[PDB]
Amino acid sequence: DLASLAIYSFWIFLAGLIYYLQTENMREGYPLENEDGTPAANQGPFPLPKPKTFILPHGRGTLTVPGPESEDRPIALARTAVSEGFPHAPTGDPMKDGVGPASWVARRDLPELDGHGHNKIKPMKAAAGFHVSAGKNPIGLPVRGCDLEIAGKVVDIWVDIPEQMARFLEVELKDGSTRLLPMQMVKVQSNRVHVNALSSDLFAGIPTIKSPTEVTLLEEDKICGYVAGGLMYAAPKRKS
Amino acid sequence: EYQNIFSQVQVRGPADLGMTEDVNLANRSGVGPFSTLLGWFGNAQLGPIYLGSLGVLSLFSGLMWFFTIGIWFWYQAGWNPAVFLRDLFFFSLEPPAPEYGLSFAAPLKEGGLWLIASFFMFVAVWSWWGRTYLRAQALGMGKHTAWWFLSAIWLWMVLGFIRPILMGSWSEAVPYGIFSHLDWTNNFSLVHGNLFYNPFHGLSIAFLYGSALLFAMHGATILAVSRFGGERELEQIADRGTAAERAALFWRWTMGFNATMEGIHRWAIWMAVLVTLTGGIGILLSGTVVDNWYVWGQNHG
Amino acid sequence: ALLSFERKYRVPGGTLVGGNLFDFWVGPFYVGFFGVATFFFAALGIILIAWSAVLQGTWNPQLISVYPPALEYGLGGAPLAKGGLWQIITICATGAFVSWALREVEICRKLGIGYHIPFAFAFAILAYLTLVLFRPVMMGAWGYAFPYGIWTHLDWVSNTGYTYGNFHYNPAHMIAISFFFTNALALALHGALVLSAANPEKGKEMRTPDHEDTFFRDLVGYSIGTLGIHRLGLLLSLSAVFFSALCMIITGTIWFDQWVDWWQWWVKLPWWANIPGGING
Ligand code: BCL
Ligand code: BCL
Ligand code: BCL
Ligand code: BCL
Ligand SMILES: CC[C@H]1c2cc3[nH]c4c(c3C)C(=O)[C@H](C(=O)OC)c4c3nc(cc4[nH]c(cc(n2)[C@@H]1C)c(C(C)=O)c4C)[C@@H](C)[C@@H]3CCC(=O)OC/C=C(\C)CCC[C@H](C)CCC[C@H](C)CCCC(C)C
Ligand SMILES: COC(C)(C)C(=O)C/C=C(\C)CC/C=C(\C)CC/C=C(\C)CCCC/C(C)=C/CCC(C)CC/C=C(\C)CCC=C(C)C
Ligand SMILES: CCCCCCCCCCCC[N+](C)(C)[O-]
Ligand SMILES: CCCCCCCCCCCC[N+](C)(C)[O-]
Ligand SMILES: CCCCCCCCCCCC
Ligand SMILES: [Cl-]
Ligand SMILES: [Fe+3]
Incomplete structure (x- = not known):
């Protein structure tokens, strides 16, 4: 039956599409890290996508993602607990240090x-x-x-x-x-x-x-x- | 308490005549007027518009489609403008009866005018599609808009062209009228054993609801991070900012996963594409392969 | 378990209830007081459905259905097997959704962002509440609410619609639909536009928003702009749901006859009512 084949085929397509969409959305921020900045053991069920390169206008160069991620700035925060999953307290003035809702990106x-x-x-x-x-x-x-x-x-x-x-x-x-x-x-x-x-x-x-x-x-x-x-x-x- | 839904202060500078790239500038109009009204919510500037031969074709056909339906309506009103306004939603330009099959032999007043109107619509829509492709190409851009438009054209083609052809008559197509086409839609479901049992209709709804869900989410998210320049999405893609990070983390913390500034637009285009893609499939199968979805669902086949 | 850029945002603060007591994460998920609340409500609800499953007979999700009290119970409580479970589950559902929205507010506060997201979600919650709370209450019975079942809730949709003939003729419904269709169109165009600029013809530089404005001006004679399009998507989506809620709250209350007949008010306007010809003369 053609409708049966259509709907069966569609669900297979949808699963592949979702897989594709999720992996595309891992081009920033992955691989996942532990709180100390080292690579987390559990990266999820989706692998990183193959890199793409954006060519930027006006001689600004290129962006290749995914690629090596680094904050490129000091982060003035310290653990408040002895285990994973708790907040990190500002070690100075968070407004001056640019952390929490005062954060900026380099x-x-x-x-x-x-x-x-x-x-x-x-x-x-x-x-x-x-x-x-x-x-x-x-x-x-x-x-x-x-x-x-x-x-x-x-x-x-x-x-x-x-x-x-x-x-x-x-x-x-x-x-x-x-x-x-x-x-x-x-x-x-x-x-x-x-x-x-x-x-x-x-x-x-x-x-x-x-x-x-x-x-x-x-x-x-x-x-x-x-x-x-x-x-x-x-x-x-x-x-x- | 400012929410950035309406602008507080509008600024205006010289008319933006736009990027050139490979665009044939002779086919661009001058800039239109500036609307302060529009400017509270979006851009105030109207125009310029590009109008080459293919665009003139498209507009002319569109208007001819519209005028052909209108002339039939006036005829049905007995040329009386009071009756025309009174019964406006009740008039209908109807396709040929089943007896005429797929031929063009039906009289003007009994299907012929419907075929003329539909021809103009066909040309209007398809020329508009070429134009969507060609304007992207002249600017060196990707063809995503044209590919999406194709998914919408799919449902339209199925309803008025492909399904009628496969069913053996123009009588199967949708009439041109406000109430009449609603009547047709209701009838279509009744005759096919209730479209709620059509799995592609169910999917189409999921994506239609999902489009409102997703645009509410995305629209809200970008307004929420507009205080960090969030709506400048191209530069955020090229050089991730705190807007993009806070946006992602809102969703990560809420539902345990998230998007990127680029990737959310892939979710976007696909959510919306799949509305008409699954929809066209559901309609095309109705009456050609499946006479009754309730019956089909009980089998399933 | 963190995004590479996430740690700097995971500071204390932003909670509305509980101080620091629930100010933590589980994996990616933020908890807070309202995370605990959502869990409680969601878990109780699902448990009560799973139990209702047994009182019904089945464990097939395509068969499981929790029906509201019969109309004879009016707005009273009902025995568990005969509507009571639906009533408790509806309280849990409301509790879950509202707790989810308030948790989102805590997340906005910690991230320093606007409250637009939970505000938008509240429209969905209000639509849900129109169907299970406000309308049923105005009509005098919980039995007018929809049942919680994958297919049985669709039965309720056609049953309820066909009570008023072809429901297409509800004018608030027409407006709702127009916003849903236009919203999907705007979502398509927005996604395609951005991707067409970010992913240009092979080998070319990324386009700019100026190219995005230009594309649409060339095409239709107008560009709403990058701010405008996000405002529009939010407006269209929320307006769709607003008019959905409206189209239902007025049905069975203010208007309970065949919706097609409502339109005769226009046709019977005195100045053209009796002019011969047309469809209605
Ligand atoms: C009683 C009627 C039947 C029924 C009969 C049908 C039929 C028949 C069809 C649908 C289709 C659809 N139905 Mg159904 N539908 C029913 C009940 C529902 C319910 C519900 C809550 O009960 C919902 C949510 C839906 C939802 C949907 C959509 C998901 C889908 C159309 C997608 C879309 O964008 O179309 C809109 C797309 C278009 C191309 C038309 C709109 C045009 C554009 C978007 C707007 C341009 C207008 C312009 C600005 C003005 C022009 C000027 C004028 C000429 C004057 N149906 C009942 C059971 N439904 C379609 C489908 O895909 O089914 C599988 C379809 O063919
Ligand atoms: C909105 C107007 C009517 C209505 C009319 C219709 C019609 C008509 C159709 C659906 C369809 C669906 N409806 Mg309904 N539906 C209503 C109210 C609801 C409510 C609610 C709590 O108010 C929920 C949760 C659902 C859920 C659903 C999904 C089972 C299915 C796809 C929707 C979708 O993708 O949306 C967009 C959202 C997303 C894409 C995000 C994903 C949401 C997921 C899919 C929700 C799953 C819910 C789960 C099965 C049940 C609760 C889980 C608990 C933990 C137990 N409906 C009201 C009463 N609904 C379609 C279907 O195929 O039904 C069989 C269909 O044709
Ligand atoms: C998808 C399945 C069916 C179908 C089912 C439906 C259903 C069901 C409905 C429509 C509606 C519409 N359809 Mg249809 N439609 C189909 C195919 C089509 C096609 C096509 C080329 O394929 C076209 C051009 C149309 C055209 C239209 C428009 C006339 C109208 C709303 C457009 C819109 O989104 O405006 C965008 C505008 C806005 C977002 C702003 C809001 C204002 C608009 C103009 C509301 C107008 C409604 C009415 C006049 C208001 C009365 C209230 C009083 C003011 C008090 N249909 C197929 C065959 N269509 C709706 C309608 O209103 O019909 C009368 C409706 O309910
Ligand atoms: C035979 C049937 C009648 C008909 C009768 C009805 C009836 C009856 C109703 C509608 C309603 C609607 N119909 Mg109608 N309708 C018909 C034909 C159509 C057609 C068409 C193309 O023909 C269309 C496009 C529509 C369109 C619509 C929408 C305007 C509206 C549904 C959206 C909504 O309420 O969202 C609102 C969204 C929600 C309710 C979802 C809320 C989600 C909650 C807050 C969160 C859930 C979380 C969940 C539990 C998931 C958790 C688990 C997982 C983690 C995901 N109808 C035909 C003619 N229509 C409904 C309406 O307006 O309701 C207000 C309604 O009740
Ligand atoms: C108002 C505009 C649109 C919108 C917006 C919107 N929805 C949202 C949001 C926003 C802005 C969120 O922030 C929030 C979210 O987190 O999304 C990822 C949400 C959300 N919209 C959702 C679903 C959803 N939204 C819908 C609609 C819409 N949402 C609109 C069209 C629909 C439909 C039917 O159209 C659905 C199904 C969820 C994915 C998510 C909210 C998740 C949530 O509340 O989680 C806490 C609760 C639980 C985890 C489980 C509760 C379990 C109950 C206790 C028992 C089940 C009872 C239920 C009533 C049974 C129903 C059975 C069905 C078969 C009928
Ligand atoms: C004010 O008065 C004047 C005279 C100035 C006017 O201008 C009045 C104008 C009007 C009153 C206009 C009114 C217009 C409407 C009410 C229009 C309504 C339109 C719809 C509701 C349309 C709905 C759906 C249509 C669909 C699905 C059509 C699809 C068509 C096709 C896929 C095309 C099929 C092509 C065919 C059959 C012919 C092809 C032949 C070839 C040789 C290619
Ligand atoms: C219809 C919406 C589809 C929901 C998609 C669910 C996939 C989310 C899993 C992502 C896991 C995150 N990790 C572990 C990749 O970070
Ligand atoms: C962008 C893709 C993510 C959305 C996934 C939507 C899943 C909806 C499930 C509804 C299935 C109903 N059907 C079609 C079985 O009746
Ligand atoms: C539509 C089905 C609901 C999907 C829920 C996905 C939940 C993702 C959690 C991510 C864990 C890291
Ligand atoms: Cl377009
Ligand atoms: Fe966007």
């Missing part, structure tokens, strides 16, 4: 480029033709932290040029230096920008960027991780 220390090889994200003042087209313009608004104190003032939008979107607010602090805050972590109001994730005293610790007119993928990850981290680690300073 991404490339160059900016993301657009299709024409220009920096994807620029301050709006250096972005020709770009302006606020709708909504409250945050530039000039005071910035308030979760302690309900003013941490600084908005002095520009960082904009994604190809995707024409606001990505960061640039905030000037009391000392005249500036930091980037992710646009997804601020609330633009009529009279202020409010940031729940950080108290005013934590704004100075936001990682700085090397150049005034560009931000690298490494810098973005440090900024974004730090700000997200404040939701856990600034909680005693967050007025409710």
Whole structure:
């Protein structure tokens, strides 16, 4: 019976498809590790896929995955138990050390480029033709932290040029230096920008960027991780 | 409390006229207008659009399909616009009766117009498919969109072309009408012994439900990690970031396994492809090989 | 037992209940208070199904079915063999799903991510609860809920639909379907688009999101963008389930006649009701 053959054949196909999909999804993060970073005995029932190579644009080289995985940074955490499966405590200030929800990845220390090889994200003042087209313009608004104190003032939008979107607010602090805050972590109001994730005293610790007119993928990850981290680690300073 | 569902502040710069690669620029329109409305949720920019010969063919046929059905509707309304609006969902352009088999000998008012409408649809859809292939090729991209589109075209072809041919008449095809095609769908199941006993119908539902499950999961996940640039998925594939790691670990910790920024899109395309792939198979087998799924299920064969 | 990049994220904190008492993992799985809760509810539920299996007769998963109390019990409790097991299992199921969502919230908090995932899951839970709790309660009996059986729950679907004729004519149902179909279309297009940029023609460089915008502008005259598409998928999927729940909560309550007849309200509008010709004249 043709329908019987069809359904039988389909289930065989589906099993192979799932096997394929799972192995494709092991191209990052595997082989699995013990807590001490050595290879785990149990790697699961799926073998690693054969490597593929992505050719990156603008002379950025290639990425071959799977390949040798390394964190490429120190991780300031220590065991809290004598057996596997428990949390690892920050050995210093987790916001400063970039662990837990304050974590960052050692991404490339160059900016993301657009299709024409220009920096994807620029301050709006250096972005020709770009302006606020709708909504409250945050530039000039005071910035308030979760302690309900003013941490600084908005002095520009960082904009994604190809995707024409606001990505960061640039905030000037009391000392005249500036930091980037992710646009997804601020609330633009009529009279202020409010940031729940950080108290005013934590704004100075936001990682700085090397150049005034560009931000690298490494810098973005440090900024974004730090700000997200404040939701856990600034909680005693967050007025409710 | 900001959730990134709607943008708080829109920015606009010069119109993005796009990447060139091997695209024939003479066939691109100018940019359209900018919609502030759209811009709250997605991109504000409309256009440009590429319109070569194959696209003009596709659009023309599509409109001719639409207008052919419309003219029949107006006729059924007695050319009265009040009756046209009143009975809009009730009008139907119906295929030829079984007597005419697979021939084109049926009169205009008794199947002929349905064949004309269907011809225009056939050309519209297939030319749109070539265009999906060709726009990818001009940009040097993979053909995934065209391969997926083929799985959807499969179900459509089975319903209106392949199954009717195998069943020996155009009368087996779907009519063009809002209520009538729902009536046809209900009837199709009744006549074939209840489609809930068709295992490919069951699978098709699994994947349809599964597509909503998966896009809810993925959409939510990416919005949840958008505070780390998560939606920039191509660069996250090329150079994994904390967005990609937190996304994976959410799912690893929740359900004990996870995806990658690239691999989740393979889950995505296949979940959705399999809806229409299994679906077309289920419909094609109905009446050609299996007259009654309940009966088949009792055997099974 | 960890991903290569995982250890730095496995810090204490984020729990909503219990402090550090259940702040740990088993293999890949995070536990927490709600992990313990989910286990308790899921285990009790499955045990009660496995036992109901025996009171029914069978151990074939294609035969096992736990039916709600008969309509004569109304909204009361029922003996275990005659609906009570269904009632207890439904409490366990709700407990399991809700505990699963709250566990997801604990995981979001530890990872420093938004709550969008458990928020989205809550739509599914509410759809489930519409069918087994809200609708049955509004109709005055647990017996209107669906039975827990692989094939028997499909019997309930056609039985329930055909109570109102062709259920296609439920307008909220039409909208629900349109969102399900459009969601699957958007999922296809999104998966294909990203993969077409990440996996270009042999030997070529990875494309950029600019190429993704360009592809769709060339094709349809518009690109929603990389942020937009994820918002859209979430919207379409949640809207599908919202309208599903709606299409059922109004059925047997506000509207209980043949759904096809609802549409006569439009046809009978005074200005065209009696104009001759067409289908309805
Ligand atoms: C009483 C009716 C029968 C029944 C009869 C059928 C029949 C007959 C068929 C299905 C099919 C399907 N059914 Mg069934 N179905 C029933 C009960 C159900 C139930 C349920 C909860 O009870 C569910 C969830 C489903 C679910 C499904 C889907 C999984 C599947 C269609 C996939 C898809 O994307 O199609 C949509 C795909 C399309 C190509 C059409 C939609 C077009 C696109 C997506 C939208 C474009 C619209 C555009 C924007 C506007 C155009 C302009 C207008 C012309 C004005 N059915 C009952 C038992 N069902 C199909 C299938 O595959 O079966 C195996 C099919 O042929
Ligand atoms: C949603 C509207 C109707 C309904 C209409 C239909 C129709 C119509 C069909 C199904 C089908 C299925 N339904 Mg149902 N179904 C409903 C409510 C439910 C509920 C619930 C708790 O509310 C569950 C768990 C299921 C489960 C299922 C699966 C057995 C099957 C495939 C679904 C799927 O892949 O989804 C998407 C999800 C995924 C892809 C993730 C995987 C989910 C797995 C498959 C769930 C397995 C559940 C397990 C067998 C039972 C519980 C396990 C306990 C530990 C004991 N249905 C409501 C009442 N359902 C299809 C079938 O083939 O039935 C025989 C089918 O044709
Ligand atoms: C798959 C099995 C059957 C089938 C079964 C069904 C079923 C069942 C349904 C449809 C529905 C639709 N089908 Mg069909 N359909 C089939 C094949 C097709 C094909 C084809 C080329 O193969 C086409 C073009 C269509 C076309 C359509 C559209 C007219 C319509 C919804 C489209 C949509 O997703 O909009 C996307 C739009 C949105 C996501 C936004 C939401 C708004 C939309 C427009 C809702 C419209 C419904 C109605 C007018 C609302 C009334 C409420 C009042 C406002 C109060 N069908 C096959 C033959 N189809 C649905 C419908 O509405 O029919 C009337 C429906 O319930
Ligand atoms: C003869 C039958 C009638 C009909 C009668 C009905 C009836 C009756 C119902 C629907 C419902 C639906 N129908 Mg209808 N329907 C018909 C024809 C169709 C057609 C078609 C192409 O013809 C389509 C596309 C649909 C489409 C739909 C959907 C809009 C909706 C189902 C989705 C839903 O509720 O998800 C919601 C999702 C859930 C309920 C899943 C919840 C999952 C829970 C929270 C988690 C479970 C975990 C689980 C236990 C797994 C754990 C174990 C493992 C680890 C996995 N119908 C025909 C005409 N339809 C249903 C609806 O709208 O329900 C609200 C409904 O009750
Ligand atoms: C709201 C939009 C869509 C959606 C979203 C969604 N679902 C989700 C999520 C989200 C965002 C999750 O985060 C969560 C998840 O972890 O996914 C991997 C989940 C989930 N969606 C699931 C299933 C599922 N979702 C569905 C639907 C949908 N989910 C929508 C279409 C469907 C159907 C039928 O369409 C199913 C079957 C699970 C995979 C997972 C939730 C897992 C969970 O709750 O685990 C804890 C509970 C258990 C492990 C077991 C409980 C056992 C019970 C005590 C006994 C069984 C009783 C049951 C009622 C019997 C049913 C018998 C059937 C034959 C009817
Ligand atoms: C406002 O008034 C004007 C006149 C301006 C209008 O424009 C009005 C227009 C309308 C009122 C339009 C209304 C349109 C509809 C209601 C359309 C409804 C359409 C459907 C519900 C379609 C559903 C399903 C169709 C399917 C499955 C068709 C499949 C077709 C095929 C696979 C093609 C088969 C080809 C054939 C049979 C011929 C092939 C012959 C060759 C030689 C190749
Ligand atoms: C329909 C969804 C399919 C579920 C797929 C289940 C496979 C998950 C097993 C992955 C094991 C993880 N390991 C052990 C590879 O890390
Ligand atoms: C992307 C693939 C993962 C999804 C796996 C879906 C399995 C659904 C099982 C339903 C089987 C019903 N049938 C078809 C036996 O009636
Ligand atoms: C659809 C069948 C449910 C599949 C459940 C898979 C559970 C995977 C656990 C992974 C352990 C590491
Ligand atoms: Cl398309
Ligand atoms: Fe994505």
